[PDB]
Every structure is written in structure tokens, then in C-alpha cells.
Amino acid sequence: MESAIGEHLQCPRTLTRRVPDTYTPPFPMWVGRADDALQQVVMGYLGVQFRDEDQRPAALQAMRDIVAGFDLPDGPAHHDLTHHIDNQGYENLIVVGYWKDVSSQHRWSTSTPIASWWESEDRLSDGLGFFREIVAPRAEQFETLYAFQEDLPGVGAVMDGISGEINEHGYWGSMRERFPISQTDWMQASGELRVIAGDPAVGGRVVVRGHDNIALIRSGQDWADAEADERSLYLDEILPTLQSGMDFLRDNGPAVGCYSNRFVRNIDIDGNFLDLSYNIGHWASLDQLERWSESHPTHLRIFTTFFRVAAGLSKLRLYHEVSVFDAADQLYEYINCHPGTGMLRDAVTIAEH
Amino acid sequence: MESAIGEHLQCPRTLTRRVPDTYTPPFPMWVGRADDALQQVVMGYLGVQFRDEDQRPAALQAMRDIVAGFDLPDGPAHHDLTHHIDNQGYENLIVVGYWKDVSSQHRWSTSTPIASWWESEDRLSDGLGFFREIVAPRAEQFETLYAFQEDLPGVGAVMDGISGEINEHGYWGSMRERFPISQTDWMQASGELRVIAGDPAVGGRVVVRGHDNIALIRSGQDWADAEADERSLYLDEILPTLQSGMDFLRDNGPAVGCYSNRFVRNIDIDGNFLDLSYNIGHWASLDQLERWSESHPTHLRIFTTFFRVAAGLSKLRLYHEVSVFDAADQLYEYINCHPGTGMLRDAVTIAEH
Numbered sequence: 292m293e294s295a296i297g298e299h300l301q302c303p304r305t306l307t308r309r310v311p312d313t314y315t316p317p318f319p320m321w322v323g324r325a326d327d328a329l330q331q332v333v334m335g336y337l338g339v340q341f342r343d344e345d346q347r348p349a350a351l352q353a354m355r356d357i358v359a360g361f362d363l364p365d366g367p368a369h370h371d372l373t374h375h376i377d378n379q380g381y382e383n384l385i386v387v388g389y390w391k392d393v394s395s396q397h398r399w400s401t402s403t404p405i406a407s408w409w410e411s412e413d414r415l416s417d418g419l420g421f422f423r424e425i426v427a428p429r430a431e432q433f434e435t436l437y438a439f440q441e442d443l444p445g446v447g448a449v450m451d452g453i454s455g456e457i458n459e460h461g462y463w464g465s466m467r468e469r470f471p472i473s474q475t476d477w478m479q480a481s482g483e484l485r486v487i488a489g490d491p492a493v494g495g496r497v498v499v500r501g502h503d504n505i506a507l508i509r510s511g512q513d514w515a516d517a518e519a520d521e522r523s524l525y526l527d528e529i530l531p532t533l534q535s536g537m538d539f540l541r542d543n544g545p546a547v548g549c550y551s552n553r554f555v556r557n558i559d560i561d562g563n564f565l566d567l568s569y570n571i572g573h574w575a576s577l578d579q580l581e582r583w584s585e586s587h588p589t590h591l592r593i594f595t596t597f598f599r600v601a602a603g604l605s606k607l608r609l610y611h612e613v614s615v616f617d618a619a620d621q622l623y624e625y626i627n628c629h630p631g632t633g634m635l636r637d638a639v640t641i642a643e644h
Numbered sequence: 645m646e647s648a649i650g651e652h653l654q655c656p657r658t659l660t661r662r663v664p665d666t667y668t669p670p671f672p673m674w675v676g677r678a679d680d681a682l683q684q685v686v687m688g689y690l691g692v693q694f695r696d697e698d699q700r701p702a703a704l705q706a707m708r709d710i711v712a713g714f715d716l717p718d719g720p721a722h723h724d725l726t727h728h729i730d731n732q733g734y735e736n737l738i739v740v741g742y743w744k745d746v747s748s749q750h751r752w753s754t755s756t757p758i759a760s761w762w763e764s765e766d767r768l769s770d771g772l773g774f775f776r777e778i779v780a781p782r783a784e785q786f787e788t789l790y791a792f793q794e795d796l797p798g799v800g801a802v803m804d805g806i807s808g809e810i811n812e813h814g815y816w817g818s819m820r821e822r823f824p825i826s827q828t829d830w831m832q833a834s835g836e837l838r839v840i841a842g843d844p845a846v847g848g849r850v851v852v853r854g855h856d857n858i859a860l861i862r863s864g865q866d867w868a869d870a871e872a873d874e875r876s877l878y879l880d881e882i883l884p885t886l887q888s889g890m891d892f893l894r895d896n897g898p899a900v901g902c903y904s905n906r907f908v909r910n911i912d913i914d915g916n917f918l919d920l921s922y923n924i925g926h927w928a929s930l931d932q933l934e935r936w937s938e939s940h941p942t943h944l945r946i947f948t949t950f951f952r953v954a955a956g957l958s959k960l961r962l963y964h965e966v967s968v969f970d971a972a973d974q975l976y977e978y979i980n981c982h983p984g985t986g987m988l989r990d991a992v993t994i995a996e997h
């Protein structure tokens with residue numbers, strides 16, 4: 292069978308898999324492929340936060356501004372827009388942009404129209420919350436998994452195409468084995484999530500730096516093309532358990548090592564919901580994410596259902612992308628956001644270490 | 645922390661674990677310890693099978709006769725007695741013996757009083773079924789896991805003592821990592837379970853050989869010293885889900901790679917039940933056992949509950965031992981057993997290969 296690891300990224304092993312070579316997965320799954328040209332991607336999550344109804348027009352307008360900024364030279368190759376309400380009652384609009392290289396994202400982010408907007412004093416006077424959570428995993432530092440072959444969402448949309456059926460899935464620990472770097476590296480977490488400028492308690496501008504091997508999961512659900520019966524199976528039998536799991540991580544993050552958990556719903560440019568959703572989960576380690584997925588009743592509750600429906604699962608599209616990053620490849624920046632927003636919640640303030 | 649792998653069995657690695665070095669288990673577990681004098685053990689499961697109530701006196705006498713032979717020179721260091729009814733409605737008395745070396749067991753089975761009994765014409769005329777399922781894993785080819793420290797049952801009883809709290813548990817794949825041979829060997833199954841003499845369809849004497857890396861699990865439950873409330877917890881909450889899982893493996897073996905599944909209850913020399921039970925499961929590969937344990941609803945259910953009750957578990961005793969064997973280190977013998985008994989069910993017949 293094909294390997295999840297791109298051919299050019301395969302190397303002599305110092306670390307090995309947990310399954311013998313005779314292993315065959317019990318159902319088909321696929322991964323994103325890209326050739327040697329793709330060395331490091333950028334995933335830029337750009338947010339707008341508000342709580343009061345009277346702020347919605349401005350918030351939607353700001354989102355429209357960000358989206359228009361993407362049509363400028365060196366904008367992302369792909370993007371999508373989502374909405375969610377956090378556990379503080381704040382509505383969050385997030386535009387996720389995907390770039391195929393670090394330098395293009397850097398040229399874009401520092402270009403006059405983009406940088407002037409971000410650095411403007413008007414960002415403080417808007418009354419809105421703004422955030423940029425921008426992370427840049429190397430090709431060896433992310434994995435993808437799709438229960439379908441076409442029209443790849445997220446980072447798969449900027450990769451070169453789709454694989455054949457892959458070997459490394461269907462067992463706990465398979466995710467890790469899909470990271471090309473797992474051939475040689477433990478992806479061990481070290482360091483702390485640190486505030487390097489500002490104070491979450493004061494609001495205004497706050498800058499948080501990530502630590503080595505924070506993991507980010509985007510795990511998605513797409514029921515936009517499902518027929519009535521499959522819609523009901525997802526909405527009545529799968530979603531409740533997924534929602535329970537997302538609520539848990541959202542409200543018990545520090546206990547399990549989840550710095551931030553968002554369960555978001557895709558929207559159009561005007562804020563109308565689309566029938567796609569995903570988790571955006573930032574984790575203190577890859578192994579903590581492994582521990583939760585393989586042992587918590589919620590994900591286990593969630594998980595067997597897929598194994599049952601996989602055979603006939605007909606139009607529901609499920610997938611995830613998981614990434615790890617060097618400390619230097621993560622930037623989490625906040626303007627006038629509540630102190631529980633994203634990486635503000637668990638970050639250690641200038642005195643807390 | 646202490647390793648599950650005995651000091652003398654630790655070697656330069658070629659295969660690695662699936663957790664980073666910083667891993668710490670969420671609750672304490674312990675393992676059997678033995679020094680380099682324990683190179684290879686023999687596990688001998690000796691059975692008497694019957695269905696008609698009128699056969700019970702003769703069956704119990706047979707079991708007593710077998711146990712008496714255990715008291716002879718080179719008899720096993722430890723033994724215990726169990727009863728179960730199989731899915732064909734036959735009652736099975738099984739005495740399991742553990743020897744600390746291969747040569748003692750061979751000397752025992754070739755000794756006249758033992759050899760003349762097994763080769764006797766009385767075995768065919770008795771009307772009872774008899775079996776011998778004898779396997780001999782090296783110290784590197786079995787692992788133990790105990791949720792307690794005192795009074796080890798099964799193979800732990802022939803080992804030297806108990807370890808401290810061990811690192812290698814609390815995650816899927818931890819069983820594999822407790823096998824000392826996992827430092828170097830995949831324990832990949834090859835070959836087939838095969839009849840080398842006789843025919844299961846006709847009864848009489850049938851002899852079956854195993855293949856490379858057949859796995860044997862003994863997973864046990866001991867509630868003898870639990871007080872009323874904790875007894876209720878096991879009998880009302882844990883046991884029904886355990887029973888469900890055992891029924892599944894008993895009746896759906898071929899589909900999951902389980903050659904034989906028995907859920908047995910300990911008995912005294914007279915046939916009276918004791919408050920201890922275990923699974924005896926023979927599997928086509930260690931990895932098939934891994935897959936079932938980490939994915940099947942029933943095991944995932946009881947897994948759930950142990951993690952929640954582990955902090956307050958006081959008298960309930962849960963453990964397992966799992967072994968893998970070289971092809972040559974197994975022998976499965978049957979006299980007048982029904983054709984679904986143990987290895988008889990899935991063995992390739994002489995007319996088939």
C-alpha cells in the first residue's frame with residue numbers, strides 16, 4: 292500500500308511504527324500529496340470578536356475587509372470563513388488563510404495595505420476584538436487524513452493532489468506515524484506558552500509566543516451534499532456526541548492540555564451558515580492530544596460510530612489536519628480580546644515563571 | 645520510573661516506543677519480576693470436557709487425577725482450576741500448570757505415570773473429552789500487568805516478585821512495549837494453525853500445531869475480598885459489559901482473529917465456584933488482539949470504567965498476562981472433544997493443506 296509520508300520525505304528510521312508491516316487498514320482513507328517544492332506552509336487564522344448586537348455590522352465589515360486583503364499580491368492560495376460563540380458569550384468570526392510558502396505570507400503581512408491596517412490606532416478604537424494566530428509547519432511537521440478523495444478543504448486545498456489509499460491509519464498512534472518527522476523525532480513539547488508583550492488583564496495589544504511542538508488540530512465535518520437520511524444520521528447520532536466532546540475540551544482545557552478549543556461553523560461573506568464545521572484545537576503537546584482522542588469517553592463515544600458507518604457512509608465528508616511547530620513558527624497576537632481568547636487564557640504573563 | 649522490562653532483559657533497541665520519554669501513566673500499575681534464571685516458562689492448560697450431567701462424577705474424578713499428577717516430581721510450580729460452558733453447551737474443566745523451565749515440564753510429561761495416562765486406551769473409552777494445550781514462551785515473549793502488588797495469580801506466581809510502579813501502561817500499544825522482545829522484534833504472525841494428525845470431524849485423537857507469534861491472553865478478575873459495595877460495582881457495572889465482550893469473541897472469533905475464547909470461573913477440587921474468573925484467549929496475531937482491545941465497543945466500555953474507578957479501587961483485583969510463541973513452542977492435543985473445541989475450530993485439516 293501507499294504511505295502517508297511523501298516519497299521525497301521518506302528516510303532511514305531511528306523511530307519505528309507500532310504495527311507490523313503486514314498491517315492492512317479496515318477501510319479506505321486518503322492524504323494530501325505535494326512534491327518537493329512545498330517546504331513549509333503558513334496557516335493564518337484571522338479573527339474578529341464581538342459580543343453586542345450593535346457591533347455585528349462592523350464585525351462583518353471587518354471580516355469583509357480581511358477577505359478583500361487576500362486578493363492582494365501574495366495573498367493566501369486558499370481560505371474559508373467561520374463563526375462561533377465562545378464560553379464567554381463572545382461571537383468570533385475567523386478567516387483561515389493558507390499559503391504555500393513562508394516568504395509569500397511574510398511579503399503579504401508586511402505589505403503597506405495589510406500592515407497599516409493591523410498596526411492602526413483604529414484597531415484599538417473600533418471596540419471590536421482582533422486576533423492573528425499564524426503558524427508555519429514544515430512539510431515534515433503536518434499530517435492530513437480524508438475519508439474522501441476530492442475537493443480537499445483546509446491545507447489539502449493548497450497541496451498538489453490526493454494520494455491512493457494509505458496504510459498508516461485505523462489504530463491509535465497512526466496520526467503520529469503520518470507526520471514525516473516521526474521517522475526520526477519524538478515531537479516532544481518543551482518551553483512555555485509565553486506573553487512577550489502586553490498584559491491579557493489590561494486588554495489592548497497582547498503578543499503570545501508558542502513553544503516547541505504545540506499541536507494544532509483542524510478536524511472537520513461536511514454534510515452540505517448529504518441526502519435526508521444521512522443528514523439525520525449526522526445531526527442526530529454523531530453531532531450530539533461531537534458537541535459533548537467539544538464542550539468538554541472548551542471548558543476543561545487545562546486539565547487535558549488543550550490551550551484553546553473552538554467548534555466553528557462555516558459561513559459565507561454575509562455571515563450565513565454553511566453545512567460545514569470544524570474543531571480548531573491548540574494543544575500543549577501532540578501526545579496530550581493522542582491521550583484525549585484514545586481514552587476520553589467523548590471521542591471514543593464519537594469514534595465507533597464511524598467504524599460502523601464507514602462501509603455505507605455515503606456523502607458525509609470527514610477529515611482532519613494536524614500540525615506541530617517550532618516556537619519561532621508561531622505568532623499569537625490579540626487586540627482588545629477578552630482574556631480567555633485563544634492562547635491568552637493559558638499563556639504565562641511577564642511575571643509568571 | 646521503573647520499566648516493565650526486567651533489567652537483565654533490557655538491550656540496545658532497534659524498535660522504539662510510541663510515547664516520548666516524558667510519559668507518566670495516570671494511575672499506578674505493577675508487573676511481575678524475575679531474574680535471569682527464568683529463561684522460558686511452560687503454560688499447560690489441561691482440560692476435561694463433557695455435556696451430559698451423568699458424566700460429571702467421572703469428569704471431576706479425571707480433573708482430580710490430573711491434579712494428583714501435578715504433585716509428582718517435576719510437576720508445575722503453580723496451578724489453578726476453572727470451569728466454563730462453551731457455546732456448544734459442553735462443560736469444560738481446565739487445570740492450568742506453570743513450570744519455571746522447559747526441561748522440568750518435558751521430564752514430567754514423559755514420566756511413566758503421566759505418559760501412560762495420556763496414551764491410555766481409557767482416554768478413548770472414557771466418553772469424556774480431554775485436551776492438552778501446551779505453550780512455552782521465553783521470558784522475552786510475555787508481559788504481565790497487575791492492578792495490585794500482592795499474591796500474583798497465573799504466571800506471576802512462578803516469577804520472583806513484584807515491581808515498583810511501571811511507566812509502560814495507560815495507552816494503546818503499551819502491552820506490546822511491556823514485551824521485552826518488542827525492543828527488537830515485530831512479533832509478526834506467519835504460517836498457519838494446522839492439524840498434523842487425525843481429523844476434528846471424526847473425533848478421536850487430533851493433534852494441532854500453532855504458527856509463529858500466536859498470542860495467548862489470560863485476563864482475570866478477582867472479587868473474593870471485595871466488600872458488598874465494591875462487589876456490586878463489579879457485578880452490576882463491570883461484569884455485564886465484560887460478559888458482552890466475551891460472548892462476542894466466543895461467537896465471532898474468525899472475523900476478528902480470535903481462534904479460541906473462553907470465559908472461565910475458578911473452582912475448588914470439588915467443582916465449587918470461587919470468586920475469581922478469567923478469559924483464556926488464543927489469537928492469530930498480537931496485533932489482532934491489539935485492534936480488538938483498542939476499538940471494540942465492549943472493551944472500550946470496561947476500559948472507560950477502570951479509568952474512573954482506579955483511584956478508589958481497593959479490593960477488586962484485575963490483571964492480565966499475554967504471551968507470544970515461536971511456531972515450534974506450542975502443541976495442541978485433543979481426545980474426543982467436539983470439533984469447535986479450542987484450536988480445533990480454525991485449524992487447517994490434513995485434507996486442506
Ligand code: HEM
Nearest residue numbers: 460461462463464465466510529533570580584593594597
Ligand atoms: C464527529 C466527528 C468525528 C469523528 C466521527 C471521529 C472519528 C475518528 C476516527 C474514525 C478516527 C480514526 C481515523 C483513522 O486512523 O482511521 C479518529 C482519529 C482521531 N481523532 Fe477523531 N473524530 C471526530 C472528530 C474529532 C475531533 C473534533 C477531534 C479533536 C480533538 C478529534 C481528534 C482525533 C485525533 C487526535 C485522532 C488520531 C488518533 C490517532 O491516530 O492516534 N476527532 N477520529
Ligand code: HEM
Nearest residue numbers: 813814815816817818819863886923933937946947950951
Ligand atoms: C473487568 C474486565 C476488564 C477491564 C476493566 C479492562 C480494562 C482495561 C484497561 C483499563 C486497560 C489499560 C491498562 C493499562 O495499560 O493501564 C486494558 C488493556 C487491555 N485489555 Fe482489558 N479490561 C478487561 C478485560 C479484558 C479482556 C477479557 C481482554 C481479552 C481480550 C482484554 C484485553 C486487553 C488488552 C489486549 C489490553 C492492552 C491494550 C494495549 O496496551 O495495547 N481486557 N484493559
